[PDB]
Amino acid sequence: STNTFNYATYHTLDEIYDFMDLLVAEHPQLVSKLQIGRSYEGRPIYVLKFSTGGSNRPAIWIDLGIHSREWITQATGVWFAKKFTEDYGQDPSFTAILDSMDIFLEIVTNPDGFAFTHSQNRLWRKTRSVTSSSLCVGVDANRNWDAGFGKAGASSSPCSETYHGKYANSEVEVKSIVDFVKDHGNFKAFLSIHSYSQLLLYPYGYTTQSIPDKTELNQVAKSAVAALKSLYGTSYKYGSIITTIYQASGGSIDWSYNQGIKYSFTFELRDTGRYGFLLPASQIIPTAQETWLGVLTIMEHTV
Template identity: 65%
Template sequence: MPRVRSSGKLKIKGYVLTKGRTLPKFPVALSAHFTALSMPGSSLVIFIMGLKKSASNSPTSLPVTLRQPLRCVPVIKGKRSSSQSSARREPPMLTMATHIAGHQCGRPTRCSPSSMKHQVLRIKTRNEEQLQKLQFLETLDHLELDFWLNPSTPALPVDVRIPAHSLQAVKVFLESHGIEYSILIEDLQVVLDREKRDIVASQQMERSSSTFNYGTYHSLASIYQELDNLASEYGNIVSKIQIGESYEKRPLYALKFSTGRGNRPAIWLDAGIHSREWVTQASAMWIARKIASDYGNDPSTTSLLNNLDIFLLPVANPDGYEFTHTTNRMWRKTRSKNSGSLCIGVDPNRNWDAGFGGPGASSNPCSDSYRGPSANSEVEVKSVVNFIKNHGNIRAFLTLHSYSQLLMYPYGYKCTPPADNAELNTIGKAAANSIQSLHGTTYTVGSICTTIYQASGGSIDWSYDYGIKYSFAFELRDTGRYGFLLPAAQIIPTAEETWLGLKTIMEYVRDNPY
């Protein structure tokens, strides 16, 4: 956003909206003289009368009137809330909003805490027309919307995190189009603060007892230390290996569970490729100890390790995971730099060489689903690809995500059923039944394309096309009440039921070699 002084010239570049209609999508440069008024918020809302499309792209000078916004809010398509009844009879006007961080009465300051809160909305569309309205919202970068569940079909809900400065605008937009929504999280910061307090309290208890609490969320350093502990405690079957390093030179550590020698058939399991999905890394750590401690005690696990090796990568995106703990809890991507852009990171689950650059992946480096400059450009992805290829005997590729309670198989980059569709569906349903048997948690089973939406460059599409028939992606708890911020109290129940589903697939792999 442009930097604004108390008076002077403001330049806005973007798409122009007027009289409730979108003009052809051409870049417009608008120069407007203004005088800043004393305002309680941190945004200027500029009402511009009678804007016309110019034949050229040269700046147009227009007089403007500044009005105090109700909140720190941008405005979409000139729509105003019903509370602005006094302005209803005014002529149609283009309404543009500029978010000016820390501007009040000409002095740097901060928005009040109440205006800073983010909300997470659940939006339900009834038809394709409403769905297209949401997809339009996705294109408005200045709103800074974070879609937790993307608008793909009217049959599925859409969850979106909305910053305070966009909240009123988005709600008015939804209401004006008759689109139903509800509030999942009233104030995101309250949830984040509670999560942080729980982590600190757990860390204090761990320091006093010198034990790793599998029922809480941990830093990367703590996770890596526990990998060492597991390898030391169960050295007869567990070893820690490094398969590569991240963009910021953090090691990519995996645990190998094996009771034999040589290049035995193996199962690959990873978690945390999307860094903010904390329940996946936490569940992977619980599962690691479960596998190690059950060998020799549980007949099923013992049989698995007597016939197969298991490789478990608990943090597939260590840079992103560290960043979620230190800077931005909602970070999803890697932390690599993008040439020609100030925006950081690539979506590592759009970066695999499987329909790369196709539907469901963005070419915009600032997007959370940015595919990257080329397939396997991310060293985190390339490290796994190289490991799988060099091993040469991986028989199942399993990956943990959150959230939505789904168990999916290929394809995502296309909607053509895979050759093994019937078999994969049968295995998936058996695993979902095992998951449900413990705590009653229900999972939806199907291909990525038919279950959620078309998405290219995903890991299990690559593994399946590479020849690993048993390729599955889990979306763990929940279905949206907490989303990526699943309370720590649900970690162990989530891990317990997930292990039952994983074990069902692993047993099938053991019994059905190919």
């Protein structure tokens, strides 16, 4: 059962997929599993929908693991999923959110890369699509979005860690989300979960242009980082992607914000470089707990 699932360890693709089914079976009135596409290598791509009813209620999107080696993100996603089912009907604030809004949680946004990190190369980041005119495999799926696609802050070199791919939305892992979010039409928040650096970022990455909602998103981010820090003292920086970390093009929240999804944020979770992508399992639960406080704060602002 999800009560005996080990949240303090890293899991395989199959384990996470089986966890999804267990959670849905345990909480059939709250959680359902949606297949939003198939990966390049034909694996199902799944989103958990948390809902207490209604018809396409205002929604929060959360993607985790788009960069496959960022294992703290999938592990955080699993914890989030369980936490949602525990706190609905117990925590006043979260209960208020789910009574009026739906949450769509994509724990393994890049399943082919995730499988590869378990079977072949722990440090695999990209998708597994094969570039026809190339010995190289995969695209940086967080540089493949139709937001400043192909502009400075991504690489045109197919072997690069930061390769943007041949055209915007070339990667089915990205296009699956784009289609789902567009078809849905009522997303109000869009949160992309990454590691590492301890940053909470709002748009843009591709341009120095200030978003029209900068004052608001900046204060939301300030509040969220304070909430996150309150638990273990984990210090996050916050601001626009381009001012806070680097220019980066073809990114998820730049795309979502340009669709009119106002509360668009990217979290870069622990740490700041000591372990980097190889974050010890002993930090999974503390990371998930503090990150939840930040995420819940954003959801509260979305209302």
